[PDB]
Amino acid sequence: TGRPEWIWLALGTALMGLGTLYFLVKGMGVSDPDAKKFYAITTLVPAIAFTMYLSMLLGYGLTMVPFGGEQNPIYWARYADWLFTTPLLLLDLALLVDADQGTILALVGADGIMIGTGLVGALTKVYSYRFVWWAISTAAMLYILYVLFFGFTSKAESMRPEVASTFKVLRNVTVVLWSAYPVVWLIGSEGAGIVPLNIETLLFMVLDVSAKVGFGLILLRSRAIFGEAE
Ligand SMILES: CCCCCCCC/C=C\CCCCCCCC(=O)OC[C@H](O)CO
């Protein structure tokens, strides 16, 4: 409670934990193999986020990085979370549209580059270089978003209508929410430092819960997750 952002870390921990438990209960008894994949991916996402939020709350997921002549508090645990949860979210989208394996690898690999370069930027001691890493990570994000909109055209003709509808919604949620992350980083403690760490933490908490629990609620309520069966 000594760090003013503790309240948002505590709320994030609680919301990710509750979301995990809800998805776990909802997925009980699901037998359809396709739906099992979606439940597994979508429950793992907030479970991982729960552990990383808790690590930030307890202080383990925080380090001090010297730059700008100050000791800057950097929550590195965010990147450990996103390293696993962001490819999983992309996998949900890719499986919906029956994406080719090559497209899945492109997405997951670009996503790993996005998170890894974000982490390097977050830990870099030379202030100006932090924004070089931010730019590379943002380029990887833009590549991901491009694929989401322009890499699935060969699947549109044979796509079930409910699949197309649910994918379209989830893709729009993804573009809007994922785009905000580089902005928050750029203006917050890890970038220009014009927004204080406590407000940055609040912003990431709202984004994370929306991108994980909100996204999951939309997906797991849809008929698109079930194979076409009589
Ligand atoms: C001047 C620096 C230039 C280098 C900047 C690199 C840094 C990372 C930037 C963007 C991510 C690149 C993602 C690479 C993954 C592309 C995979 C691919 O090409 O997939 C095509 C295939 O047909 C399947 O759809």
Swiss-Prot record:
The modification N6-(retinylidene)lysine is found at K212. GO terms for molecular function: light-driven active monoatomic ion transmembrane transporter activity; monoatomic ion channel activity; photoreceptor activity. It is a multi-pass membrane protein. It comes from the Archaea. Keywords: Cell membrane, Chromophore, Hydrogen ion transport, Ion transport, Membrane, Photoreceptor protein, Pyrrolidone carboxylic acid, Receptor, Retinal protein, Sensory transduction, Transmembrane, Transmembrane helix, Transport. The record marks D81 as: Primary proton acceptor. Its main location: membrane. It is found in: Cell membrane. Residues 26-39, 93-103, 151-168 are cytoplasmic. Coiled coil: none annotated. GO terms for biological process: phototransduction; proton transmembrane transport. InterPro entries: Arc/bac/fun_rhodopsins, Rhodopsin_retinal_BS. Residues 59-75, 124-130, 188-199 are extracellular. The covalent binding of retinal to the apoprotein, bacterioopsin, generates bacteriorhodopsin. The keyword Transmembrane applies. The chain crosses the membrane at residues 6-25, 40-58, 76-92, 104-123, 131-150, 169-187, 200-219. Belongs to the archaeal/bacterial/fungal opsin family. Light-driven proton pump. Homotrimer. This is Bacteriorhodopsin. The lineage of its organism: Archaea, Methanobacteriati, Methanobacteriota, Stenosarchaea group, Halobacteria.
